Amino acid sequence: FACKTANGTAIPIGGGSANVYVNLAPVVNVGQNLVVDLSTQIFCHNDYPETITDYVTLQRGSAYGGVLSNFSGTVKYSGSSYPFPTTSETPRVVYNSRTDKPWPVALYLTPVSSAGGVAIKAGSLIAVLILRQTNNYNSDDFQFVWNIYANNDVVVPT
Amino acid sequence: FACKTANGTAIPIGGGSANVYVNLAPVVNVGQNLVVDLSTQIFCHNDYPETITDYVTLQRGSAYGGVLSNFSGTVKYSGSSYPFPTTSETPRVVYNSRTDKPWPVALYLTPVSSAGGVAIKAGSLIAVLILRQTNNYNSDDFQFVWNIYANNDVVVPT
Ligand SMILES: CC(=O)N[C@@H]1[C@@H](O)[C@H](O[C@@H]2O[C@H](CO)[C@@H](O[C@@H]3O[C@H](CO[C@H]4O[C@H](CO[C@H]5O[C@H](CO)[C@@H](O)[C@H](O)[C@@H]5O)[C@@H](O)[C@H](O[C@H]5O[C@H](CO)[C@@H](O)[C@H](O)[C@@H]5O)[C@@H]4O)[C@@H](O)[C@H](O[C@H]4O[C@H](CO)[C@@H](O)[C@H](O)[C@@H]4O[C@H]4O[C@H](CO)[C@@H](O)[C@H](O)[C@@H]4O)[C@@H]3O)[C@H](O)[C@H]2NC(C)=O)[C@@H](CO)O[C@H]1O
Ligand code: NI
Ligand code: NI
After folding, report:
1. Nearest chain B Cα distance for residue A141, angstroms
2. How far apart are CA B59 and CA B57, in angstroms?
3. N or C terminus: which one in chain B shows less Cβ crowding within 10 Å?
4. How remote is the CA of residue B13 from the centroid of ligand 1, in Å?
5. Which CATH architecture describes the domain B2-156?
6. Is the Cβ atom of B134 under 6 angstroms away from ligand 1?
7. Does a cis peptide bond (omega within 30 degrees of 0) precede residue A12?
8. Contact B89, B117 (CB under 8 A)
9. What is the dihedral of CA A66, A69, A71, A77, to 10 degrees?
């Protein structure tokens, strides 16, 4: 079981960490949503599906930089809404195909009342999301750590 | 990670056991050495070397039959000498190629002062060597057990 991003960055068997740079909506009004859809960037496969099924959760997530300071929001995992930052583990997603299939994570963030000007500086760390893989065969309990970086400024006009 | 012998006998992923039949000096004097070079019999590979590192040790080695009764000895593991029978686990050998590569083990056995006559009966178990595989990714601790059989009698002249 391993995970790849669109831009080529990979975390191999056994887990690890990676830096993912995501393009953001250059401007977001107070009361609009900013969406960070990792389901179109992170894809995971099962390396021996004939005997084993892999179990994937969003174990925990934290906000940093402008997302921490200037945004409230939730995370959507496989169709359900969860608090963000998430302090508790999500239900499991099954992987039993060699075919790259998405990690169904998307952040829904709204600027806060007092937000104004550059609310996310380009190149800054905006979140850390921990993917936890287990299986039905082994004692394997791996963490794939995704450090989420902003590719561009995000402006909240006032 | 799996291991094969020269005559084709194999121990699959997860570990197991095999019989290795070794040719010995038909006659060996007290103070001469009898050498069992396993590096020409046992071969192991790493089944995913690109991301993974396999670690191999001699967990224990034990003497049986005539070798126990009538021989002193040492084992040489990857350039270093250790007593045989073994009093500790050995440092690690790295396996990082899908190509079958030897297990760098050699037994040096010398008949003891009181040794005389037939010291090893052909077909008898003379040693058991436990190869322990680990890795750099999970908690896998697998045992590849090698039962060492004499292909011929050995006589210690008096
Ligand atoms: C004789 C017999 O039957 N013995 C039994 C044995 O077969 C059986 O287990 C399986 O043996 C198969 C024999 O080939 C193995 O298939 C290959 O797996 C490779 C990946 O191996 C690593 O991953 C597995 C699974 O664990 C990871 O993945 C799962 C799945 O998501 C996940 O749950 C885990 O958490 C983890 O992320 C591990 O078991 C392996 O561990 C062993 O080996 C490592 C490395 O030495 C040790 O460190 C470790 O301790 C173990 O000893 C590995 O970590 C795949 O890379 C490989 O893919 C090739 O072949 C398939 C076959 O179709 C292709 O589809 C695929 O594209 C790929 O082909 C490419 O590469 C080939 C050569 O590399 C080449 O020939 C091709 O042309 C092409 O280029 C394949 O899927 C299988 O993994 C073994 N399973 C297990 C669980 O170990 C065991 C199991 O009970 O019993 C024996 O008795
Ligand atoms: Ni793979
Ligand atoms: Ni193999």
Report:
1. 8
2. 6
3. C
4. 9
5. Sandwich (2.60)
6. no
7. no
8. no
9. 80
